Amino acid sequence: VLNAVRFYEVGLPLSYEQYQRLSPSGLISRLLNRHEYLLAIRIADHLRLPTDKIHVHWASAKVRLGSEDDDTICRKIVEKLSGKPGISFEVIARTAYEEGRTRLATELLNHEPRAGRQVPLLLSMEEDELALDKAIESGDTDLIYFVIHQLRRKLPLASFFRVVSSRPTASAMVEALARNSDGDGNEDTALLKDLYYQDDRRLDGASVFIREALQQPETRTASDKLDLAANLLQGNQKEHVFELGALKEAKMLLRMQETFERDLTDSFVGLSVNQTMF
Amino acid sequence: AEQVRDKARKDLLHLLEGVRGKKNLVIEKDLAGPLGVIVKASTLRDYGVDNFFFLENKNTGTSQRNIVFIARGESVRNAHAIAAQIKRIQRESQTSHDFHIFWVPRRTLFSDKVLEEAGVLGDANISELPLYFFPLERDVLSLELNDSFRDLYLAKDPTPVFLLSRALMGIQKKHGLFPRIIGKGENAKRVADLLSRMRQELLAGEEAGESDRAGLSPSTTIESVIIIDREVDFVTPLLTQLTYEGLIDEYFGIQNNQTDVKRKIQLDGSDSLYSQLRDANFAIVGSLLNTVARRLKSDYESRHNTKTTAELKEFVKKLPGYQAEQQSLKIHSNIAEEIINYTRTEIFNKLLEVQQNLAAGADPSSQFDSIEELVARDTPLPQVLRLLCLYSCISGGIKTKELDHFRRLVLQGYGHQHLLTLHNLERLQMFLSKSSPLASMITMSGSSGGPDQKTNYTYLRKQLRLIVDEVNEQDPNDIAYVYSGYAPLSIRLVQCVLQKQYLLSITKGSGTVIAAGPVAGGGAQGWKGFEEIVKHARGPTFDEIQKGEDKAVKARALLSGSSGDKKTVFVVFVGGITFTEIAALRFIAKQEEARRNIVICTTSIINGNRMMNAAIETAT
Amino acid sequence: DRKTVYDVIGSHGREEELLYYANAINDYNYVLSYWVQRERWTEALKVLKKQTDPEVFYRYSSVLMTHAATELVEILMRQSNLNPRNLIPAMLEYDRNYKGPLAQNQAVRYLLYVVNQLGSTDSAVHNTLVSIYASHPSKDESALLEYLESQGEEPNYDPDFALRLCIQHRRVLSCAHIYTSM
C-alpha cells in the first residue's frame, strides 16, 4: 500500500511512524477525499479493511460531482452496490435528495424492498404518492395509515384527498379512518363527503347519513337524516335507477308508520310493508 | 387448522405471563369471540386474571394492580376506549395501576399515537400480540374479520386483504413458502402480489440493516395456495343452504360455534352427531335425527338395564357420550322443528324451487309469484332478499321493466331501511341491472380482467357443470347437493385448480365444450386447460412460482405425495367464505383426502344472513 | 387412569386444569410437552428449579435458549454435581438460528459465564468453546482470542482446527494473533 501510493503519478509516501499514527481507515480516506476509488479498494484489500465505505463515498461523489443524468448515474451506482451487499442505498439516496437528484434517490430506494424503512424515508424526503405505494405493495396497514396521517396533516385537504384517490387502496383506508372519528359509530361526515366526491361514491355518502338516520332514535331523527342523505343522491339517474328512487320510497315508508302510531295507537314503526299489512 | 391453536395461545398467554401480580383483563367484544375459540376464561384465570371487562360498555375497576387490554389496532375505537378506561381507573385507583396493552401483530403508529395523546398512557406497556387465523374448526382457519365483507366491498377497504396476505405469510414463513401462488379476482391478485413482496421484505430486513435475513425456503409439506376473491362468484352467496349446518345458520346464525337458543353446549365437528349430520341435506336430516334417537335410545334407555358389571361396563364408558348425544339430540330436534315449520308451510321448499329454476336458466319472471308469497308470509329478511337478488345475477342483467317488480318486494320486505339495503347491494355488486354501464358479461377474449366486468354465468353454465340433476341428497357424488343441484361456481373455480381430474369432469358440460375434455385433462399445473373459463370470470388472473435453486426439488417432492405422506393445500377466500362454500370444500377435501390435506382459509366466515342484513345490523 | 384424563381434556381443550393435575401425578414428560406448546417462560424455570432432570434438561433447554439462555445457566449450575457438557453445547443450536452481531455477543457471554463458573478442564468443553468462539467471534475478535490465550495452549488442543476457523473469518490481521497464541 505504501508503494501503491508512492508512485509519481498518484501517491502520498508514508513512514512507519506516520503509518501507525494515521488510522488504518485513514489509508483509505486519504484517497476517497481525492475521489479515488480504484486505488482505495486496492489499499483496503491489502489491509483487509471494509470496502463498503469506499463504494458509498464513490456513489456520493457521482451524485454531487457528476455531470451525467440521474438515470445514467443511478444505474452505475446500483450495479456497483449490488455486488457489495451491505446497507448503502439509503445513504446514497439521502445524499441524492440533498443534492436535488430526487429521481436518482427514487431508483436507489427501489433496491431496499422493506417498506418499513422506505416509507419513512420517502416521507422524510417529502415525496408523496411513492410513500403510499411502498406501504401498499408491502401490505402494511400501519405504514399505509401512517402515510395517510402524514398526508392528512401536511396537505390542506384538497391535495390530501386527490393524492389518495390516485391510489384506491389508500382512499378506502382514508374512509376507514373517517368512518371512526370517535369510534363506535361516530363517523366524520366532513371527511367522508370529500373522499366520496373523489371516487364518485354518491350512494356511500347517502349511506353514511342513512346509518345515522337508523342508529339515531327511530322516526324522530330518521326523517331528518334521511332527508339529508337524499342530498347526496342528487346525481345522474343512469345506473343507479332504483337506488336513487328509493329515497322517495324511504320517506313514504316511514311516514305511513308514524301516521299509524298517531291514529291507531299501536305503533307500526320499524315494520316492513308486508308486516304492517299483516 | 387446529395446529395453529397452540401458536395463538402461545402469544396470548405469553404476554399475560409477562404481567406480574394479579391483573384485570379488558377484552374487545368483537375480538373476545375469536379469543374464546383459543383460550377459556379459566385458561386466563390460571395466569392471574381476576375480573373480565369490556371496552364497548366502558366496564372498569380498581380491584387489581395490573390492568391488561386486548384489542384490534385497525380502528381508533379501541385506542379511545382503552385510553378512556385508563383515565377513569387512574382517577379512582388507590394503587400503582400499571397498564398493559396488547395489539395486532404489528401495532400501528396511529394506535400508539392516539393512546399517547390521552396524556395518561405515558407509562403504558404496549406490545404486539400476533394472533391470526383462529382455529374456528378443525378444517377451517379464520382471521375472524367479521366486518371484512361489508367494508372490503362497500368502501373497497383493503384492510382484510393486507391482513390476509400477512396472516398467510405468518404460516408459510414457518411451514415453508408456497412453491406456487395462484388466484382469481382483484383482491385475490393483491394477496398473491403481497405475498411475493412480503418474501422480499424478509430478505430486505438484512439489506435494510434491521432483522436477520430469513432463508425463505419452499415448503416440503405444502403444495400450493389458491386465492379466490368474493367478487368472482356473486351468485352462490345468494342461495340458501340446504344442509343441516345451513339450517342452523339460515334460521339462527352460527358464530364462535356458540350461537343463540344455550351456551352450555358447543356445537362443532368434535360432536359425534354433528360430524354426521352437519353436512346432511334438510330433506334427509329429519330422518337422521330419528335414526340417532333410535340407536341412542337403544343404548341409553335400554340394553344396559339389569346388566352386571362384566357387560354393563360397555355402556358405562360410553354413557357420557350418550348423555352428550341426548343433550345434542334435543337441540338438533329443535332445529329440525324450525325447518319443519318452513317445509310444511311452503316456505323453505318454495325458495328452493326458485333457486333451482333460476339455476337451470328459467326466465326469472316466472319465479316472481313464488317470491311474492315468501314476502307475504313474513319470512326472514335475508331469505326474501336473496331471491330478489339472485334472479338478476343469474341472468346477467335484466331490463328495468322486470327489475322493478322484484325491487318493489325489496322495499316492501325491508321497510324504510330498504334504502340502505339497495345501496349496499349495488356497492357489494350483488344486484345487476341492464340499464347500468357496468352491465357487461365477459365475452371470449373480450379484453377481460377489468373491474367493470362481470362473470358470465350465462356462458359458464355451459362451460362448467353448474347445473346438476344427478344429486343424491343422502349419498351425494357432487358438491351440488348442498344446493340440490347448483354446483356453485366459486367451488368449481377451485376444484379445477386443486386436481386435473376435477378439471376434466367439471368442464365436461355442453356439446360445444366437451370437445376440450382432452385439453382440460392436461391441467396438471396452474390454470392450464382452464383458461377458457378463467378468462370469463371477473377480475385479473394471477400465476407465479417460488424462485430459488431448490424450487424444482420441493416441487417434485410435493407432486410425489401419497397416502403415507399427505401434502397440505391452502384454499383461500378473500372477503369471507359462506357456510355453503365450506361444506362444498369439505366434500371435495374428503375425496382428495387420500393424497392431500386441504384446509379452508378465510378472512372471515360469512353467515348466510350476514350479507343481506348489512342494512339491519349497521342500522341498529 | 391417567390416559383417560389426558384424552378427555384434549377433546375440549381445558389444558390449565390438566396441568395442575399433571403436577400432582408428576407426569414430567407431559408437563414439559405442554409448556413447549405455550412457551410460558415463568413456568419452565419453576419446574427446572424444582426437579431439573438433567437427562431431559438439555433437549428442553433447546427451546428456552432462544428467550434467555443466561437464566438457564444459573438454575442448572447450582444443581449439585453437574456434568459441564450439559450447558456448553446448547449454544451450537442457538447460533444456527441467528446471524446478527447482537446474537453473537450474547452467545459469547453465555459461554464465558458457563465455563468460568464450572472451572472445567474437560477437553470436550474446551474444544466446543474454541469452535464457537472462532466460528462466531462478533466484532471484537481480539478480546475473545485473548480470553482463550489467557487460559493457555491446551484448551485449543488441535492447532489446525483453531487456525482454520480463525483464518477463514479474517486473514493476516487475525492470523498473526492465533498463530502466536498456539
XYZ file of all heavy atoms in Angstrom, chain B residues 184 441-450 453-456 459-460 493 527 530-541:
242
model
N -57.745 -15.801 -8.507
C -58.609 -15.086 -9.438
C -59.382 -13.972 -8.740
O -60.019 -14.195 -7.708
C -59.590 -16.057 -10.100
C -60.649 -15.384 -10.959
C -60.109 -14.985 -12.316
C -60.997 -13.948 -12.948
N -60.807 -13.859 -14.420
N -71.399 -8.719 -19.547
C -70.900 -10.050 -19.248
C -69.675 -10.311 -20.105
O -69.653 -9.962 -21.285
C -71.977 -11.099 -19.506
C -73.255 -10.923 -18.693
S -72.992 -11.096 -16.916
C -73.122 -9.390 -16.387
N -68.652 -10.902 -19.511
C -67.398 -11.106 -20.220
C -67.568 -12.012 -21.433
O -68.190 -13.071 -21.352
C -66.331 -11.686 -19.281
C -66.015 -10.673 -18.178
C -65.082 -12.006 -20.073
C -65.270 -11.258 -17.002
N -67.010 -11.578 -22.561
C -67.069 -12.335 -23.804
C -65.730 -13.002 -24.097
O -64.730 -12.732 -23.430
C -67.472 -11.430 -24.984
O -66.452 -10.447 -25.204
C -68.788 -10.731 -24.680
N -65.713 -13.880 -25.097
C -64.500 -14.610 -25.440
C -63.393 -13.665 -25.879
O -63.535 -12.939 -26.862
C -64.797 -15.626 -26.541
C -63.626 -16.530 -26.905
S -64.039 -17.720 -28.200
C -65.014 -18.913 -27.285
N -62.290 -13.679 -25.134
C -61.139 -12.825 -25.411
C -61.532 -11.355 -25.536
O -60.860 -10.580 -26.218
C -60.441 -13.282 -26.678
O -59.955 -14.591 -26.541
N -62.605 -10.965 -24.854
C -63.100 -9.593 -24.912
C -62.373 -8.683 -23.932
O -63.005 -8.020 -23.109
N -61.045 -8.673 -24.007
C -60.229 -7.858 -23.110
C -60.709 -7.983 -21.670
O -60.972 -6.979 -21.005
C -60.260 -6.403 -23.543
O -59.721 -6.246 -24.828
N -60.852 -9.217 -21.199
C -61.375 -9.461 -19.863
C -60.341 -9.177 -18.781
O -59.138 -9.151 -19.045
C -61.864 -10.889 -19.745
O -60.804 -11.802 -19.774
N -60.819 -9.002 -17.552
C -59.946 -8.809 -16.399
C -60.132 -7.442 -15.745
O -59.421 -7.097 -14.801
N -61.082 -6.662 -16.250
C -61.335 -5.330 -15.711
C -62.310 -5.366 -14.533
O -63.101 -6.301 -14.400
N -66.198 -5.389 -15.297
C -66.747 -6.564 -15.971
C -67.310 -7.565 -14.968
O -66.857 -7.631 -13.827
C -65.659 -7.229 -16.810
C -65.073 -6.337 -17.884
C -63.796 -6.902 -18.452
O -63.148 -7.738 -17.805
N -63.422 -6.456 -19.647
N -68.288 -8.361 -15.394
C -68.853 -9.370 -14.505
C -68.776 -10.784 -15.067
O -68.798 -10.994 -16.282
C -70.298 -9.029 -14.160
C -70.443 -7.836 -13.237
C -71.866 -7.689 -12.733
C -71.945 -6.637 -11.640
N -71.761 -5.265 -12.180
N -68.711 -11.751 -14.156
C -68.653 -13.163 -14.501
C -69.865 -13.573 -15.326
O -71.010 -13.315 -14.948
C -68.572 -14.022 -13.222
O -67.412 -13.643 -12.459
C -68.486 -15.490 -13.568
N -69.610 -14.210 -16.461
C -70.673 -14.556 -17.394
C -71.328 -15.891 -17.056
O -71.052 -16.905 -17.698
C -70.126 -14.566 -18.811
C -71.196 -14.617 -19.861
O -72.334 -15.027 -19.602
N -70.852 -14.198 -21.052
N -72.822 -18.000 -19.759
C -71.869 -18.685 -20.623
C -71.247 -19.854 -19.871
O -71.045 -20.936 -20.426
C -70.787 -17.715 -21.104
C -69.764 -18.318 -22.043
C -70.104 -18.585 -23.359
C -68.481 -18.590 -21.590
C -69.166 -19.124 -24.220
C -67.544 -19.130 -22.452
C -67.882 -19.395 -23.762
O -66.950 -19.931 -24.627
N -70.935 -19.623 -18.600
C -70.255 -20.614 -17.781
C -71.170 -21.773 -17.408
O -70.701 -22.861 -17.080
C -69.694 -19.956 -16.518
C -68.596 -18.893 -16.742
C -68.158 -18.357 -15.398
C -67.422 -19.503 -17.492
N -64.305 -23.268 -9.551
C -63.120 -22.492 -9.908
C -61.930 -22.860 -9.029
O -60.793 -22.494 -9.325
C -63.406 -20.991 -9.774
C -64.447 -20.397 -10.748
C -64.737 -18.977 -10.338
C -63.915 -20.436 -12.172
N -53.343 -22.960 -14.109
C -54.649 -22.792 -14.732
C -54.743 -23.529 -16.064
O -55.711 -23.354 -16.805
C -54.932 -21.309 -14.975
C -54.949 -20.477 -13.731
C -53.962 -19.646 -13.300
C -56.009 -20.381 -12.754
N -54.334 -19.042 -12.128
C -55.587 -19.477 -11.783
C -57.262 -20.975 -12.633
C -56.375 -19.152 -10.697
C -58.059 -20.646 -11.546
C -57.626 -19.755 -10.603
N -57.843 -24.656 -18.243
C -58.992 -23.977 -17.666
C -59.072 -22.526 -18.138
O -59.942 -21.772 -17.703
C -58.899 -24.045 -16.139
C -60.186 -23.825 -15.388
C -61.334 -24.526 -15.712
C -60.238 -22.941 -14.329
C -62.493 -24.340 -14.999
C -61.396 -22.754 -13.616
C -62.527 -23.459 -13.953
N -58.159 -22.138 -19.033
C -58.071 -20.752 -19.495
C -59.385 -20.246 -20.081
O -59.751 -19.086 -19.896
C -56.964 -20.596 -20.544
C -55.538 -20.674 -19.998
C -54.960 -22.066 -20.006
O -55.674 -22.996 -20.307
O -53.795 -22.198 -19.718
N -60.102 -21.121 -20.779
C -61.369 -20.744 -21.397
C -62.344 -20.198 -20.364
O -63.143 -19.310 -20.657
C -61.994 -21.946 -22.112
C -63.353 -21.667 -22.758
C -63.276 -20.681 -23.889
O -62.224 -20.558 -24.470
O -64.267 -20.050 -24.173
N -62.291 -20.748 -19.162
C -63.201 -20.367 -18.096
C -62.653 -19.238 -17.243
O -63.383 -18.325 -16.865
C -63.525 -21.589 -17.242
C -64.398 -22.532 -18.078
C -64.200 -21.168 -15.942
C -64.419 -23.933 -17.589
N -61.363 -19.297 -16.948
C -60.736 -18.281 -16.118
C -60.915 -16.904 -16.745
O -61.191 -15.922 -16.051
C -59.235 -18.593 -15.950
C -58.528 -17.457 -15.249
C -59.078 -19.864 -15.162
N -60.764 -16.840 -18.062
C -60.864 -15.591 -18.807
C -62.276 -15.006 -18.827
O -62.452 -13.844 -19.189
C -60.374 -15.792 -20.242
C -58.871 -16.012 -20.368
C -58.466 -16.243 -21.818
C -56.958 -16.421 -21.952
N -56.553 -16.674 -23.363
N -63.280 -15.808 -18.465
C -64.669 -15.350 -18.486
C -65.183 -14.978 -17.097
O -66.362 -14.659 -16.926
C -65.587 -16.409 -19.106
C -65.509 -16.485 -20.604
N -64.603 -17.281 -21.266
C -66.238 -15.867 -21.562
C -64.777 -17.150 -22.569
N -65.764 -16.300 -22.775
N -64.293 -15.005 -16.110
C -64.659 -14.635 -14.747
C -64.143 -13.232 -14.423
O -63.208 -12.741 -15.056
C -64.119 -15.662 -13.765
N -64.785 -12.581 -13.454
C -64.446 -11.206 -13.084
C -63.060 -11.063 -12.467
O -62.673 -11.833 -11.590
C -65.469 -10.652 -12.104
C -65.154 -9.257 -11.578
C -66.242 -8.727 -10.723
N -65.838 -7.514 -10.023
C -65.927 -6.267 -10.518
N -66.407 -6.060 -11.718
N -65.523 -5.240 -9.793
N -62.336 -10.033 -12.903
C -61.029 -9.699 -12.345
C -59.889 -10.374 -13.105
O -60.125 -11.191 -13.996
N -58.651 -10.003 -12.780
C -57.395 -10.487 -13.332
C -57.040 -11.886 -12.834
O -57.590 -12.366 -11.843
C -56.400 -9.440 -12.825
C -57.004 -8.949 -11.523
C -58.500 -8.956 -11.768
N -56.103 -12.531 -13.529
C -55.634 -13.860 -13.144
C -54.177 -13.817 -12.701
O -53.331 -13.230 -13.374
C -55.773 -14.857 -14.309
O -57.140 -14.917 -14.720
C -55.318 -16.249 -13.872
